[PDB]
Design a binder for this molecule. Structure first.
Ligand SMILES: O=C(NCCCNc1nc(Nc2cccc(NC(=O)N3CCCC3)c2)ncc1I)c1cccs1
Ligand SMILES: O=C(NCCCNc1nc(Nc2cccc(NC(=O)N3CCCC3)c2)ncc1I)c1cccs1
Lengths: 648, 648
């Protein structure tokens, strides 16, 4: 069976989505053969008043955006003469399709997540300008397309639950999915509890809030033990009893206590600087009370505050940590040091910056626009003088789910995704560990070369200091000899001889430091090229190979799950590949824990020692340099004492 | 239909390859279900003597290697009781399968090519140790597998043309493919011309030589106008009339002159340093005369000479060129400067090295093993003082093949590969251009910061010079005054006053240079962040997107070519996608020539100017620094003249 129109034709076999009122089919144009999404209304929809079915058509006419799926034309089917919608086709799937990829099981990358935020807001903002509410915002209703620049672009669709609504106009009707439903709408739609309430446009922001937490963590904010489906009552108690500010809540036992948390889970894949901005945003937009809830202006202000911010990559040698500093293009270096202090706890005055081999000096009022180009591979380093605990990288240690001998195809494919998702997360940490050690080797190399510059300039000063002093003591000796031929002077020589003797000891102790900076002087960076891992070890490429064999089985298990039943051939191979998948995953985790992690552990342990070796040396080099300056400001009073004896 | 054995079973539908004597089928083990390649001999093979069919089994028993497809067992078919071979399965295809990928149409990458060389030699070397000749070495007979580390691994197979042969033992029988055939064997196998000749083990090296040229360029060395198939006679005249040393020869007209070349084509994707080692190797192993031909020792010596070499990435700012220096781990920096001079034409003494923000100094005898880690993204820069022409990147400008309105499915899929291969090459150049400009910005930034160090130390010397001079002239004035109270000296003051006046002019002209190094002093690198392209332009990602749409159509055209005939649906869509493929390719080439290339052209033009601005300034800064040293060696004769007047 297949339907057709005047300018379009589609198969009933190609179904993009299946909704209540209508379905959406992958179809082609009759003349050009180009792909378009055809939405066909079923007869059930025609048993609604003439105003409801009118809006959805009058809505798409007024709406056209880059973050909204473009409606090209409205035509009639050849037989039923039903109104069909010619929508823009998005072959890349929906946001739901993306979140099914095992790599995103523990949250989207920091890059693809910001795109989602950028496009969703932009689509919702365009709905706000026209005054259209959606009331059904789910990852399934957010499509994804590949732009000309490769960057993903997200558009909103499925406006079957949409209608024209004024800025302050309320309603009583119900729309939306279960998990992404507002506490007040969940009260009537799921538990069905009428306390005589009305709903504004705040219900859109909740559906957005739940969706956003799902993209960054890989799971829903509020999770009962049985789940939102198996136990609907617990789901409602969490959202209506949630403390103001909390962004998540999960019970870990059947009919037990609920664990609320006002912070992102460690499993998240976002930077620390991004979570600082995100957490308060999710806190206020997620609450039952309309008073404490945010408005669109307060929503857009904070989101546009984040999207306008650029990113300056900063790596701290002292703590061995990587940071993404989210700063505005119009902020100064003063605000920059504040933002770095908030994460790394380093005082603004102790922050010495290093970039591409050289130390970096910042003007107190230079804008962030003119800051040097930074990447994770080549960021700006921050080494402190004040001692700090080397924390390193923090990640949630996650193991493989237990495998049942059960044959359940739905369970195997679901186990396949989960277990492929754990290896994807393990591979993500391994590649991060490799970056930390490599930036460490580059940072330490740059640091020891920088200290040599301090040593060299100090010596140049010491040579400049010793010349003035040796001439001064030589010039007075001639003066006191012509006196004997024909109090102060005696008191001057005492200090001068003591200075020359102390200057001599400095000269010797500086050679000791030079012996420390010398190759193999305990401060050498030769240890770093042994202890930890190297890019030449190709540990990540190894993990990726096993992961390639795992993702091959997983996508095959989906097609086996899609068949519902399998022939004898595909059945027994599925039983065989189930252990092969497990033997691949266990080999990876074994290789991950025994090779990648351990070599990084030993690198972190030997890093702390060298840091303490460095901090000690820079202190001694500091004092000796200051002693050269103390004499420098002392000879300024000396060079004008004896040399000014010849005024007239 | 399907055959089976005692421990194995395979379908006759799954065919890996089809040869003369036997075929190879993708099969599975009965118990484990693991994949193995089953080779089944046809009845035609049984009409050969008992010695010929014996060897191939006795050969695989004696041979087991990492670069040789492992034979696991020899079993008998259930019905025919024919001897079947259980071979190692290589799902990644053969070398022929790899060369069909459009990206490798103009030659393999420098990385995947060296792996081929490493594995082929290693496989051939293991054949040499056992004394087994192959006589059928083709890209189809070289399999590829993904190692545990992700690196490709190539193994030899199809030993149907193989037999035991001593180190000096010859033969008269014939084996091999047409294009990869030795001139003496081509003389009897294709043109069939018996001049009473015998063949040694040199015939293997020719089949290797032709294969290697096919992997680096993407085409065969000797190409007639019609081709090696449509015109067999011309093929023979090229290989038997080839000048000693030439590695290629192509006639560009029907029945016309042959164009010989002893150098790699510009379309090649190998570095300049790798072609220097490769060219002479291909020259001697490719010749009819056994006298001038190379032996395995002379073959292995040069190939192991290359494979033992490491790679030091070097970028020349002066010529705006990237270089791969192939050096041994036991070579010194003396040999290193020689290897750099051979490519960049820069004298060993004028070579000033820069790495990660700082200038690099090399010990005359330091081994290459301890050289700093280098990559293309972070290589060692070489800036000269002697002027050099800025060549930049050199590539062959290749356009799209003309598209016929003809419907020929074989022609369309072949046109699809070719036209997808041109966009792949265009995308390769674009990503290289992006790297050249980025390394240029980093190199120039590092350079101007380095010149500031030279300026600063010169000032420190000038301040050190001016102090001695000002004291010297002050010390003599007191001496000549006590003389008047109670020739040389007069001649000394003349030079001293002239030195102090010249020192004053230096002080002023140094401030001029400081005004040149100052932001916006015509030597600023602010121009580089405007003129050329940036990674933020995402030009490569754009080209990749169109290329993704093209590679989607190409693989679909292969399946359409495989069907031989198409249903009406797939037929007309093929006709529609043919222009869609062309509109994608033309949009890419248009975007490539008007955006990527042009912005790079303007960057190269503004680079030459700044280089001339830099070379001029460093000269003036040099002379002024030398004038400070000239006075320094002049005051050493002065400070011991007047200050030594007080000996007794
Ligand atoms: O409108 C709706 N709901 C929104 C959803 C349907 N709507 C559209 N869906 C696409 N495209 C699309 C979709 C889905 C999945 C995929 N891709 C995959 O799963 N793949 C393909 C590769 C392998 C796995 C591409 N375009 C346009 C539209 I409009 C409604 C559906 C039923 C009532 S309302
Ligand atoms: O031995 C022979 N000649 C060498 C060739 C055949 N021999 C083997 N071939 C594989 N594996 C294989 C092969 C080919 C193609 C591919 N892959 C593809 O084309 N694909 C798959 C993905 C889509 C495109 C994988 N293993 C083992 C062997 I042994 C002979 C063949 C007939 C007489 S002799």
């Amino acid at each position: 069976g297949s339907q057709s129109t005047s300018n379009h034709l589609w198969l009933l076999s190609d179904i993009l989505g299946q909704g209540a009122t209508a379905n959406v089919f992958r179809g082609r144009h009759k003349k050009t053969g180009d792909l378009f999404a055809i939405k066909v209304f079923n007869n059930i929809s025609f048993l609604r008043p003439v105003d409801v079915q009118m809006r959805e058509f009058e809505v798409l006419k007024k709406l056209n955006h880059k973050n909204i799926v473009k409606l090209f034309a409205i035509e009639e089917e050849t037989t039923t003469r039903h109104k069909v919608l010619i929508m823009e086709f998005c072959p890349c799937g929906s946001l739901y399709t993306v979140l099914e990829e095992p790599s995103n099981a523990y949250g989207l990358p920091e890059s693809e997540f910001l795109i989602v935020l950028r496009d969703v807001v932009g689509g919702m903002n365009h709905l706000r300008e026209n005054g259209i509410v959606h009331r059904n915002i789910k990852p399934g209703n957010i499509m994804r397309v590949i732009g000309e620049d490769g960057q993903s672009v997200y558009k909103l669709t499925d406006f079957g639950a949409a209608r024209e609504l004024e800025d302050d106009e309320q309603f009583v009707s119900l729309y939306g999915t279960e998990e992404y439903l507002h506490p007040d709408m969940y009260e009537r739609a799921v538990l069905r509890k009428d306390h005589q309430k009305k709903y504004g446009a705040t219900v859109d922001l909740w559906s957005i809030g739940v969706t956003f937490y799902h993209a960054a963590t890989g799971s829903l904010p509020f999770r009962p033990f049985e789940g939102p489906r198996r136990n609907k009552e617990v789901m409602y108690k969490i959202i209506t009893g949630k403390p103001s500010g909390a962004i998540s809540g999960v019970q870990k036992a059947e009919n037990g206590p609920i664990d609320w948390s006002g912070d992102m889970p460690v499993s998240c894949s976002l930077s620390r600087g991004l979570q600082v901005l995100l957490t308060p945003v999710l806190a206020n937009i997620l609450e039952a009370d309309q008073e404490k809830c945010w408005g669109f202006d307060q929503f857009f202000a904070e989101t546009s505050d984040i999207l306008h911010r650029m990113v300056i990559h900063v790596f701290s040698l002292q703590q061995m940590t990587a940071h993404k500093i989210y700063i505005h293009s119009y902020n100064t270096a003063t605000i920059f040091h504040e933002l770095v202090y908030k994460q790394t706890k380093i005082i603004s005055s102790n922050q010495e910056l290093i970039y591409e081999g050289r130390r970096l000096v910042l003007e107190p009022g230079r804008l962030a626009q003119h800051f040097p180009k930074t990447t994770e591979e080549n960021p700006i380093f921050v080494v402190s003088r004040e001692p700090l605990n080397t924390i390193g990288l923090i990640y949630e240690k996650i193991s493989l789910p237990k495998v049942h001998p059960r044959y359940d195809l739905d369970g195997d494919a679901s186990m396949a995704k989960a277990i492929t998702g754990v290896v994807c997360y393990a591979c993500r940490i391994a590649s991060t560990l490799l970056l930390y050690q490599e930036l460490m080797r580059k940072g330490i190399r740059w640091l020891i070369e920088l200290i040599k510059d301090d040593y060299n300039e100090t010596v140049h000063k010491k040579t400049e200091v010793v010349i003035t002093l040796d001439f001064c003591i030589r010039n007075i000796e001639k003066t006191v000899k012509v006196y004997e031929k024909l109090g102060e002077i005696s008191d001057i020589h005492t200090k001068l001889l003591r200075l020359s003797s102390s200057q001599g000891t400095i000269e010797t102790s500086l050679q000791d430091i030079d012996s420390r900076l010398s190759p193999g002087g305990s401060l050498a960076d030769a240890w770093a090229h042994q202890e930890g891992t190297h890019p030449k070890d190709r540990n990540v490429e190894k993990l990726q190979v096993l992961l390639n064999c795992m993702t091959e089985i997983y996508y095959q298990f989906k097609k086996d799950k899609a068949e519902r039943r399998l022939a004898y051939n595909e059945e027994q191979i599925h039983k065989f590949d189930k252990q092969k998948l497990y033997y691949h995953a266990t080999k990876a985790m074994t290789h991950f824990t025994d090779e990648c992690v351990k070599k990084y552990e030993a690198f972190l342990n030997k890093s702390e020692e060298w840091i303490r070796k460095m901090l000690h040396l820079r202190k001694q080099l500091l004092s000796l340099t200051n002693q050269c300056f103390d004499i420098e400001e002392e000879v300024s009073k000396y060079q004008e004492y004896t040399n000014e004896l010849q005024e007239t």
